[PDB]
Design a protein around this motif. Structure first.
Motif, PDB file in Angstrom:
ATOM      1  N   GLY A   1       5.879  47.012   1.291  1.00  0.00           N
ATOM      2  CA  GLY A   1       5.282  45.729   1.623  1.00  0.00           C
ATOM      3  C   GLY A   1       5.922  45.100   2.833  1.00  0.00           C
ATOM      4  O   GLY A   1       6.094  43.874   2.888  1.00  0.00           O
ATOM      5  N   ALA A   2       6.326  45.924   3.794  1.00  0.00           N
ATOM      6  CA  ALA A   2       7.019  45.424   4.965  1.00  0.00           C
ATOM      7  C   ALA A   2       6.182  44.363   5.657  1.00  0.00           C
ATOM      8  O   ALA A   2       4.952  44.450   5.708  1.00  0.00           O
ATOM      9  N   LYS A   3       6.867  43.365   6.219  1.00  0.00           N
ATOM     10  CA  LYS A   3       6.213  42.244   6.882  1.00  0.00           C
ATOM     11  C   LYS A   3       6.047  42.460   8.382  1.00  0.00           C
ATOM     12  O   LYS A   3       5.195  41.812   9.002  1.00  0.00           O
ATOM     13  N   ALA A   4       6.842  43.338   8.977  1.00  0.00           N
ATOM     14  CA  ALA A   4       6.794  43.577  10.414  1.00  0.00           C
ATOM     15  C   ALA A   4       7.540  44.868  10.708  1.00  0.00           C
ATOM     16  O   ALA A   4       8.295  45.371   9.875  1.00  0.00           O
ATOM     17  N   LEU A   5       7.341  45.364  11.928  1.00  0.00           N
ATOM     18  CA  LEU A   5       7.963  46.578  12.441  1.00  0.00           C
ATOM     19  C   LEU A   5       8.574  46.278  13.797  1.00  0.00           C
ATOM     20  O   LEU A   5       7.890  45.742  14.678  1.00  0.00           O
ATOM     21  N   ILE A   6       9.838  46.650  13.976  1.00  0.00           N
ATOM     22  CA  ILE A   6      10.517  46.545  15.262  1.00  0.00           C
ATOM     23  C   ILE A   6      10.707  47.953  15.813  1.00  0.00           C
ATOM     24  O   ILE A   6      11.240  48.833  15.125  1.00  0.00           O
ATOM     25  N   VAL A   7      10.262  48.161  17.050  1.00  0.00           N
ATOM     26  CA  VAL A   7      10.420  49.417  17.768  1.00  0.00           C
ATOM     27  C   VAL A   7      11.131  49.104  19.079  1.00  0.00           C
ATOM     28  O   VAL A   7      11.420  47.947  19.385  1.00  0.00           O
ATOM     29  N   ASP A   8      11.481  50.142  19.824  1.00  0.00           N
ATOM     30  CA  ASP A   8      11.941  49.858  21.175  1.00  0.00           C
ATOM     31  C   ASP A   8      10.881  50.327  22.160  1.00  0.00           C
ATOM     32  O   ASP A   8       9.798  50.783  21.777  1.00  0.00           O
ATOM     33  N   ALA A   9      11.196  50.170  23.442  1.00  0.00           N
ATOM     34  CA  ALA A   9      10.170  50.329  24.466  1.00  0.00           C
ATOM     35  C   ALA A   9       9.664  51.760  24.514  1.00  0.00           C
ATOM     36  O   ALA A   9       8.466  51.996  24.734  1.00  0.00           O
ATOM     37  N   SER A  10      10.550  52.734  24.293  1.00  0.00           N
ATOM     38  CA  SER A  10      10.106  54.120  24.344  1.00  0.00           C
ATOM     39  C   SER A  10       9.124  54.415  23.219  1.00  0.00           C
ATOM     40  O   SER A  10       8.107  55.081  23.432  1.00  0.00           O
ATOM     41  N   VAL A  11       9.401  53.913  22.016  1.00  0.00           N
ATOM     42  CA  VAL A  11       8.484  54.123  20.904  1.00  0.00           C
ATOM     43  C   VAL A  11       7.172  53.392  21.142  1.00  0.00           C
ATOM     44  O   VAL A  11       6.093  53.914  20.843  1.00  0.00           O
ATOM     45  N   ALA A  12       7.238  52.160  21.645  1.00  0.00           N
ATOM     46  CA  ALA A  12       6.005  51.416  21.877  1.00  0.00           C
ATOM     47  C   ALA A  12       5.111  52.134  22.878  1.00  0.00           C
ATOM     48  O   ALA A  12       3.878  52.100  22.766  1.00  0.00           O
ATOM     49  N   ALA A  13       5.714  52.769  23.881  1.00  0.00           N
ATOM     50  CA  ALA A  13       4.941  53.468  24.894  1.00  0.00           C
ATOM     51  C   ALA A  13       4.346  54.769  24.376  1.00  0.00           C
ATOM     52  O   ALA A  13       3.345  55.241  24.925  1.00  0.00           O
ATOM     53  N   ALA A  14       4.934  55.351  23.332  1.00  0.00           N
ATOM     54  CA  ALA A  14       4.530  56.663  22.849  1.00  0.00           C
ATOM     55  C   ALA A  14       3.459  56.608  21.770  1.00  0.00           C
ATOM     56  O   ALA A  14       2.842  57.637  21.481  1.00  0.00           O
ATOM     57  N   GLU A  15       3.162  55.424  21.237  1.00  0.00           N
ATOM     58  CA  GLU A  15       2.640  55.274  19.888  1.00  0.00           C
ATOM     59  C   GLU A  15       1.972  53.924  19.751  1.00  0.00           C
ATOM     60  O   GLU A  15       2.558  52.926  20.188  1.00  0.00           O
ATOM     61  N   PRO A  16       0.780  53.836  19.161  1.00  0.00           N
ATOM     62  CA  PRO A  16       0.134  52.523  19.027  1.00  0.00           C
ATOM     63  C   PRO A  16       0.639  51.715  17.839  1.00  0.00           C
ATOM     64  O   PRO A  16       1.080  52.259  16.824  1.00  0.00           O
ATOM     65  N   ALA A  17       0.570  50.389  17.983  1.00  0.00           N
ATOM     66  CA  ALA A  17       0.668  49.512  16.828  1.00  0.00           C
ATOM     67  C   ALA A  17      -0.527  49.734  15.907  1.00  0.00           C
ATOM     68  O   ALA A  17      -1.597  50.178  16.330  1.00  0.00           O
ATOM     69  N   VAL A  18      -0.343  49.397  14.635  1.00  0.00           N
ATOM     70  CA  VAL A  18      -1.359  49.598  13.607  1.00  0.00           C
ATOM     71  C   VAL A  18      -1.837  48.236  13.128  1.00  0.00           C
ATOM     72  O   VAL A  18      -1.021  47.378  12.770  1.00  0.00           O
ATOM     73  N   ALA A  19      -3.154  48.041  13.109  1.00  0.00           N
ATOM     74  CA  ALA A  19      -3.699  46.781  12.622  1.00  0.00           C
ATOM     75  C   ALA A  19      -3.153  46.490  11.230  1.00  0.00           C
ATOM     76  O   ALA A  19      -3.054  47.385  10.387  1.00  0.00           O
ATOM     77  N   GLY A  20      -2.796  45.229  10.990  1.00  0.00           N
ATOM     78  CA  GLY A  20      -2.210  44.827   9.729  1.00  0.00           C
ATOM     79  C   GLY A  20      -0.703  44.924   9.660  1.00  0.00           C
ATOM     80  O   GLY A  20      -0.102  44.386   8.720  1.00  0.00           O
ATOM     81  N   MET A  21      -0.068  45.585  10.621  1.00  0.00           N
ATOM     82  CA  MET A  21       1.387  45.710  10.652  1.00  0.00           C
ATOM     83  C   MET A  21       1.883  45.142  11.972  1.00  0.00           C
ATOM     84  O   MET A  21       1.902  45.846  12.996  1.00  0.00           O
ATOM     85  N   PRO A  22       2.280  43.871  11.998  1.00  0.00           N
ATOM     86  CA  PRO A  22       2.828  43.294  13.229  1.00  0.00           C
ATOM     87  C   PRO A  22       3.970  44.145  13.753  1.00  0.00           C
ATOM     88  O   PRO A  22       4.864  44.540  13.006  1.00  0.00           O
TER      89      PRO A  22
END
Length: 419
Positions: free
Chosen positions: A115-136
């Motif tokens: 039931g995680a409320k949010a996800l923290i990534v770094d810039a390399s992960v954000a560039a490699a991979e999309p965010a998922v609707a419903g998971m900030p």
């Protein structure tokens, strides 16, 4: 006599939880070196200020985050990971380590079960991979940006019974819920048994998917010492890791036996090379270690002691330590050792009745480090987390390890495989 050892209440834990102990050191000795990750070195004050910027920007972005909120962290082992975890803890929340190498469907399962409320990534992960609707999703690089107005400690209230992390371990993964006080107790026992002080230099070499990465990352920060983060590239190069431990004057290292073997083999084959001569303790865990390998280690590192460590993720890392010195009579099978303080350990039959000393049975444990169970899995939690039928001074929890063992007359425990 029956197979019972009782250490509940044996060790006073102090007033401050792990993040607060770090804050204490940052206030007292701001300029001491806190964390090294390859080319990056942070003083206590630099690490604390950066964690606070992250923490305050997280509270701006997610004003409802706090006690028992779970935040996924998909950042590789680094200063960035340490900073993000500290920030999460400072605002009263808990984290889930989600190694960037894990596939996305694994990440999805982990965040959904928790039931995680949010996800923290770094810039390399954000560039490699999309965010998922419903998971900030939010990005480390933005959270840590300079702003001198955002550098004070949040001073959110933390309780020892609050979650500090959920760690997942073929079926759907099971996420063990660990609380601040259990995490602190593991660290407190280790700080004593590893003879730690402000000069301790501790390796953070384990994968972030393993619970031991938590005490490795933070224990030195509770003592005024230094964490050295050794990432996958460094640990995969045995010669390079050995040279790093030499040049860093590392004092504390935990490994699993197959990696211990690689280290031992390398030093034996290269007796000319510099060695980790500042090591005071090597801890081995994860699988069964054998006496001959320990003796080979002691020949190479005669100034060290070795701790064989055992315990389930579910009880906040270890429940026994077996401390050995080079002169000791070390034979197979190697014991898993003595109960950590603030636990009771029993060898029991299928009905939880303690068995006589020397009889094999199930290792079960009660005490301050027994966690809450598996997030979002009430049924499998009920299979292993049950009300203790024994005296208890904490929350009445018992964990059944699923491991067989036996207890010696002196209370030293022996491991005998899976039940």
């Amino acid at each position: 006599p029956l197979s019972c050892v009782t250490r509940q209440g044996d060790l006073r834990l102090g007033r401050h939880l792990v993040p607060h102990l770090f804050e204490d050191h940052a206030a007292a000795t701001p300029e001491r070196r806190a964390l090294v990750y390859n080319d990056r070195a942070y003083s206590y004050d630099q690490l604390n200020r950066a964690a606070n910027r992250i923490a305050n920007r997280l509270m701006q972005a997610f004003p409802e985050l706090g006690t028992d909120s779970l935040v996924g962290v998909r950042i590789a082992r680094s200063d960035r990971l340490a900073l993000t975890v500290l920030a999460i803890w400072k605002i009263g929340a808990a984290y889930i380590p989600i190694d960037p190498v894990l596939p996305a469907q694994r990440m999805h399962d982990m965040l959904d079960l928790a039931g995680a409320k949010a996800l923290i990534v770094d810039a390399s992960v954000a560039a490699a991979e999309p965010a998922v609707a419903g998971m900030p999703r939010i990005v480390f690089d933005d959270l840590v940006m300079d702003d001198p107005l955002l550098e004070d400690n949040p001073e959110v209230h933390l309780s020892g019974n609050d979650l500090s992390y959920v760690l997942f371990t073929t079926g759907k993964p099971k996420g063990a819920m660990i609380e601040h006080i259990g995490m602190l107790n593991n660290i407190a026992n280790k700080a004593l048994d590893l003879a730690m002080d402000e000069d301790s230099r501790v390796a953070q070499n384990a994968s972030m998917s393993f619970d031991v990465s938590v005490w490795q990352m933070f224990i030195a920060l509770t003592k005024g010492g230094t964490t050295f983060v050794y990432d996958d590239r460094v640990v995969n190069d045995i010669a390079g890791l050995i040279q790093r431990m030499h040049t860093d004057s590392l004092t504390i290292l935990e490994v699993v036996p197959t990696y211990l073997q690689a280290l031992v083999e390398y030093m034996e084959e290269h007796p000319d090379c510099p060695r980790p001569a500042a090591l005071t303790f090597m801890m081995v865990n994860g699988e069964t270690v054998d006496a001959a390998l320990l003796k080979r280690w002691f020949a190479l590192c005669p100034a060290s002691k070795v701790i064989n460590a055992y315990g389930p993720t579910e009880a906040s890392d270890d429940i026994t330590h077996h401390i050995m010195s080079p002169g000791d009579e070390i034979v197979n099978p190697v014991p898993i050792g003595r109960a950590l303080a603030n636990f009771d350990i029993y060898i029991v039959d299928d009905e939880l009745r303690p068995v006589p000393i020397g009889t094999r049975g199930e290792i079960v444990v009660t005490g301050v480090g027994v966690g809450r169970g598996y997030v979002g899995m009430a049924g499998v939690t009920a299979q292993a987390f049950v009300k203790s039928p024994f005296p208890d001074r904490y929350k009445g929890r018992l964990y059944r390890t699923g491991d067989l063992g036996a207890m010696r007359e002196d209370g030293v425990l022996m491991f005998h495989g899976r039940k």
